[PDB]
Design a protein around this ligand. Structure first.
Ligand SMILES: C[C@H]1COc2c(N3CCN(C)CC3)c(F)cc3c(=O)c(C(=O)O)cn1c23
Lengths: 155, 572, 578, 578
């Protein structure tokens, strides 16, 4: 869709007023680019909170995944966007979603030491015994990274 | 016009950050002790290319600068990767002008641009570089290169990897010194003295195809052609040159300082007139540049093919609706300015004589105004036909991601003052999706797979590898090993590539690697040795330029900590 | 003055002779085809450093001389070892003295001497380097490097050697070119084009710490932090500085030959203004040496003197200006590890800045009298040469003409000095300019025992070299800047001879073999700095004439006792004697 | 005199085409963008030598020309083979004639020709090379190297191969950077600081023989001297010199482009005076050539003529001057293996100095008359071009413009030479300037048999190349000077084609495999010197105009004859005809 492309580039750039007119003009809420990223994906990746909110109100698929299995909750947990992680979980995002590598958002937050996000994820039912394709849990990530603050959160 | 020096290097198969942190920075750190240097800027892009441009004070000898710059660079050559030294790091005065552009096509349509380019490299470029008063000559393409297009399915069938193919080629495409019989010092009275001749370079696709990779434990032999497709091709395919829709090559010829332009132009056309009897059937010489250009730039992530369809529509528009005026349309897919890549292109238009262009509608201005209005309705592509220079500096090691946020803060603040500033925009490229693959060391070591085997398998197949040289009809040319295109297109093709472990078992890439999508820069800029982002713009109507610059300086004075700025180019 | 060009190369962890027999001689044997060359001198020190100084005839274009020397060395580059090439060689035209010194201190005290030096190198040196007429920039300190401080007891516990550390760092701190998806040439119908990103160079000690060296047979994993301490630290720890007795770093600014003195200076001051707004809190630029008004104080200790003893002489010199001439001295910038001549663990220098000329009244308080009094006060410091000077004897070179050797040349030098001491009516202060031999630790690898146990010699020489001298592995990115990674033993385990046996090397059968099994050691005497003049081993001798006699008679005498020297010992005049 | 810049590389044991396609073509393809360049020629001969000559317009600043060429050569340096870079590629700007020749003899007969050659190269050549105005110094001989002369019988006896010998020499003749004790950063309070001295480069034949190759399973040691003869010997054995029949050596010195002949010749005599007092007993300097007084006698034999055959032609030339012209000739300095057109086994040169002008009264005793009789006496020497000259024609180049190949350029040259013979009215003595193709040994490695036996290709090519061509390994120290270490077979075992089968290579399973088991051979012809003009293969042809007719008429006939040659063959005029 021509509108869907203008929405993707507007969501990628954080233009909330252009995103609103595109929503009112009937643009596809779930238009995906070549890599499989929806407007919710890029707004979650680039930390545009209200674009994440406006999209979800207009029926955005909170659990859309790209060609490699990554959800908008994955990107938000990876890049320290704490407020976006909460609104995604509140709008029904799968806390235990796995990509093609069996990797969960808890792994991504633990890998980058996003402790505030780790607590919010486990508060919403994140499986802490979740293993990726190599059999590594979030606890193994804390031991390997040497992050002792996280290693006591997970216990 | 302030003199300038350009250092050009190439890292085949490298991403923008890879070239900056292994090449660009090391060269920038060695640019010390060079006299009369005003400022320095550099690019590092998608295609594994860096161009460091050092501009000097007006009145500086461009020859002395070129020598002073190259001497310091050459002393830093051991610090660059081996793949970069092999490709050659040129330092030429960017004394741009181009005396003339000579194109080479074939009317019979029996030659690819690769075929044509090889002819120009071998038969023309040298004899043109020797004609009276010519300087540097750049060829639109490259000479032939022995292309090995690997197939991972058959490679895995015989328990082979690209490492074996590279090992086999260096062993069986070698020119070995073997000594003499009866050479000095001899047994006194020796009568026989003959040179010993052992392996020589291979000369054909047939001889590369019979390279013995291995022999099974049964009698069967597996050769290089059993796992790959062999062909004479180009060294890189990042540019596709066309002339009126036909495959094309040619030379860009610059004049050597102190020579005369009308002289050398006639001396070149005379040197080309002598070569025509030696041309194969149908080879013609054109002069594709009373002229103008047309820019083509597609969204981030677009392919070379999609740029070609837009360039073909542009070539078609000029040859159809402007057939009364347009004489030639030289379309270059993959080259533009502010950035090269698969999603950019440029078109060079040559028009008939102005004596046969009566009417204002046939003047260049009315031609570009009409062309720009028709190109307005090209879906998902910008196509135009045809101030101040600001540099935002990373002054405290912030990083590319934060320097972009600081850039957007200044760009947004500048749009708040359309009364003084207009068309404030970045000159560089935006971040694009990239395929990050993470090698898991623990799984690789558990399986006995060498890290070097992995990074060579991945790199050589997906990016290409310059192994060694060979002799093509008596001339030294390159040998490149790469995957056939079918098996290096999409992420699922990664799982098809197998590496061999120490115990002998073939391990697929999927077993020891993970992959994600992320965003990164396809073109990192640097100014005076520090990460930079160039910003262009102009004053609003009725405002002096210095009025606009001070507002930019005011807006830049509130950017996050560690973010500075400088004026360059025409604003220096 | 005759224009001079200096070549600088370094060899990490190499002694004087290793450096001379591998770098100096190879460079010198290729210095042919150079026009207007008067003579050539070189130094090879136990710091692992060469400085070859080529002096050209008067009126020679220093640009042409540098270009010709630069191009000749470019051809000799493949003849040098890989370790010397990785360090980068420098060819510089410049004077011997400094144009100015830019000091950098930290009032807050949040940055130590080591951090201040790293900031100036990582954020100030390169831009000052490219400025108008600045020929030589000397950093009083060292840029940070990713320092891996190996522990031999932990390496032996996991059956690992520094070879495994260096191998794993090169594998897991790599910048991999991985190509593209949908790259050219592409299959038709391809809609996706994206760069592939494999491994990126590491950026933090945390990343280096989790470099996986090996996994054990029970599943547990050995990380790089399990066998070493991962910290940021300088490439070298040779030079440290102080401004008015407090931690400091700085840049020594030399004027490029032919450049204007002042307009350069203002350009450095201009670029410095561009940097100040982005300094961290507490950082401040001071100007301790600006070329009346300033003078220097040289401090030279004999070979075999440590930084501790040199620092003691520097404190005494700094304490003098700050206490007994505080009415005249504004500031004192003191550097240890760097003297006027060159580098050395036994050398130092102090840049003294005076108060404004108007505030010091009378003959008693001007640079001439202050330097006379200072030199008089420093003259009784034992086992040290301490002179004070602003901004006339002979310069003599004793040449090894027939391949005699260092020891035989030393005896001949002492013979000439003893005979010159018996003529106080003629020559006084006849002295060698170089250094005396010092105890060194000769270790012999028994090849037979190494082969019987199945221990590679390169594994042995890498384990010994990387641990006790340091090893430049590859480069990493520290806050967006390319810096070096260095592998070396923690201080603890490379200080005294008994520690040699603490180092283990793995044999072909996986057995850990201590260094004591295949080595043997003894003390002997070797040189810490080896001089050459015009390609031949030489020893510079300085001196002057007695009260009231012209150097011509002085010089003529020196020629005569050189004739009675042993067979194969020549001589030549240089410097201002030429 | 047009200014010329020459690039000279070396590739030991390499044939003409191997040198052409790994060094020559690589350097040539980057020789564009060079200002005021008229033309460029090159020779690649089976000496393992390439000589690219770049000629510039008159008035071109030779200094600048050199920088430009050198600067374009750097683009090819990383692409050249390692073995070529290790020899040291050189670029120089000099005339092609000799300014003078410095001869060295030993009146006491204490020193062999080889001994005199080594002393000149080690103690005399470098200081002359660095003298201002000296463009190029040609040594008439070769500096000593540590020659390892391998025995293949004894090597096979202990399951060893030249690869093992090479690996042992790099391991045991090593210069190790071993570090220090108490090095910075130290544990605070450290008092002891000493350099660690590990392996040093060997300095004698006795030390190289001590090199342990392996320990047999029973416990006995197999040393290098047990499989090789170890001696000091020249880097190559291709240049021998004689002075009045007695053994001698010397340096051929060409003047740098634009330098003063008198001043440079005087500076050379001043430098020679600095080294005479330290000569060994018996050594003496003689001056056989000084630029009437002098003339040269060029000797050039057919290709394939050994140094033996060339010495006899030189002996007849020296006999003529010493017997029949003894009233006018003072000295004859004869050089075998080096010639006017370069360097090769089949070439020679005699430098003749007449006695004083006063003691040669009469015109028949003048230079032209003496050279006139000399050439007339050398008219009837079989298979030799022997003429004498004091110091009309045309200079013709036949170019392969369509990649026809060397063999087809030969025929196109023969067809042109035959048509030029039928026109004596216009063209006189039209002949080529290069060499004719000679028999050569073509050996074929069966890749399948090698892989089936476990014998690696690198083990094969290193064994064959090092035994039959010699391999430069590393450096050693000979009387305080860095010199090369060469590994080669003893002459005895590299003389006949059956000696190939006596060379063994160890397979992966450990079994020795004779070279006959995986190879085959046949005789064929190939060029011992390949010429190139402006990048393309060429064959130089020279002749002169007939009596009375100008050169433009002869050139016009040559142009017409050359246009009748097969398609793809072109031409161009060079040198005196440009
Ligand atoms: C490197 C750039 C330089 O600019 C180019 C041209 N010019 C445009 C008009 N003037 C600005 C003069 C220069 C041009 F006409 C053609 C080509 C071209 O074919 C080409 C290639 O790689 O195929 C590459 N380039 C070209």
């Amino acid at each position: 869709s021509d509108l869907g492309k203008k929405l993707l580039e507007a969501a990628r750039a954080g233009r909330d007023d252009e995103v609103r007119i595109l929503m009112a003009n009937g643009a596809d809420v779930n238009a995906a680019d070549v890599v499989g990223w929806t407007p919710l994906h890029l707004a979650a990746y680039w930390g545009h909170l209200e674009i994440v909110e406006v999209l979800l109100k207009n029926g955005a698929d909170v659990n859309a995944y790209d060609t490699l299995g990554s959800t908008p909750l994955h990107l938000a947990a990876h890049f320290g966007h704490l407020e976006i992680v909460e609104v995604l979980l509140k709008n029904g995002a799968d806390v235990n979603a796995k990509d093609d590598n069996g990797i969960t958002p808890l792994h991504l937050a633990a890998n980058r030491g996003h402790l505030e996000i780790v607590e919010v994820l486990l508060k919403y039912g994140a499986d802490v015994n979740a293993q990726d394709k190599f059999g590594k849990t979030a606890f193994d990530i804390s031991i390997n990274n040497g992050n002792e603050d996280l290693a006591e959160i997970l216990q | 016009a302030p003199p300038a020096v350009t250092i050009s290097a190439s890292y085949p198969g490298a991403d923008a950050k890879t070239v900056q942190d292994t090449v660009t920075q090391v060269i920038e750190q060695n640019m010390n002790g060079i006299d009369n240097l005003m400022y320095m800027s550099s690019n590092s892009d998608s295609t594994g290319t860096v161009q460091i441009t050092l501009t000097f004070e007006s009145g500086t000898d461009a020859d002395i600068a070129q020598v002073q710059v190259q001497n310091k660079l050459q002393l830093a050559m051991p610090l660059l990767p081996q793949e970069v030294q092999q490709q050659g790091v040129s330092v030429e005065k960017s004394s741009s002008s181009f005396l003339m552009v000579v194109g080479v096509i074939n009317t019979d349509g029996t030659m690819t641009q690769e075929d044509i380019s090889d002819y120009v490299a071998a038969n023309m470029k040298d004899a043109i570089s020797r004609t009276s008063g010519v300087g540097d000559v750049q060829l639109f393409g490259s000479q032939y290169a022995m292309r090995i297009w690997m197939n991972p399915n058959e490679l895995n069938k015989f328990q082979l990897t690209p490492v074996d193919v590279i090992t086999a080629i260096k062993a069986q495409n070698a020119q070995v010194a073997a000594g003499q019989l009866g050479g000095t010092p001899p047994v006194k009275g020796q009568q026989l003295n003959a040179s010993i001749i052992a392996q020589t370079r291979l000369t054909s696709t047939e001889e590369f195809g019979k390279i013995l990779l291995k022999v099974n434990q049964d009698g069967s032999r597996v050769l290089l052609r059993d796992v790959a497709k062999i062909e004479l091709g180009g060294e890189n395919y990042d540019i596709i040159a066309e002339f009126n829709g036909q495959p094309a090559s040619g030379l860009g010829i610059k004049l050597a300082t102190g020579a005369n332009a009308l002289d050398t132009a006639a001396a070149i056309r005379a040197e080309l007139a002598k070569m025509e009897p030696f041309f194969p059937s149908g080879l013609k010489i054109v002069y594709p540049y009373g002229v103008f250009m047309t820019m083509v730039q597609l969204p981030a992530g677009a392919t070379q093919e999609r740029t070609q369809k837009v360039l073909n529509e542009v070539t078609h528009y000029y040859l159809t609706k402007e057939k009364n005026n347009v004489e030639s349309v030289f379309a270059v897919n993959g080259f533009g300015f502010a950035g090269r890549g698969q999603n950019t292109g440029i078109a060079f238009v040559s028009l008939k004589d102005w004596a046969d262009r009566p009417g204002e509608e046939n003047k260049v201005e009315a031609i570009t105004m009409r062309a720009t209005r028709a190109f307005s309705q090209i879906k998902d592509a910008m196509v135009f036909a045809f101030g101040f220079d600001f540099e935002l500096i990373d002054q405290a090691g912030l990083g590319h991601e934060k320097l972009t946020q600081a850039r957007n803060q200044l760009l947004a603040e500048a749009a708040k003052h359309p009364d003084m500033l207009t068309s404030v925009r970045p000159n560089g490229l935006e971040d694009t999706p990239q395929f990050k693959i993470d090698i898991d060391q623990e799984k690789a070591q558990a399986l006995g797979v060498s890290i070097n085997d992995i990074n060579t398998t991945l790199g050589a197949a997906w990016g290409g590898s310059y192994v060694n040289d060979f002799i093509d009809r008596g001339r030294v040319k390159k040998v490149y090993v790469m995957s056939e295109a079918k098996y290096r297109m999409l992420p699922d093709d990664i799982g098809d590539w197998y590496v061999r472990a120490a115990d002998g078992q073939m391990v697929p890439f999927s077993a020891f690697s993970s992959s994600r999508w992320e965003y990164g820069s396809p073109r990192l800029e640097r100014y005076n040795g520090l990460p930079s982002m160039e910003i262009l713009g102009q004053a609003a109507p009725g405002k002096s330029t210095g009025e606009a610059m001070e507002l930019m300086e005011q807006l830049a004075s509130k950017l996050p900590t560690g973010v500075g700025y400088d004026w360059t180019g025409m604003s220096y």
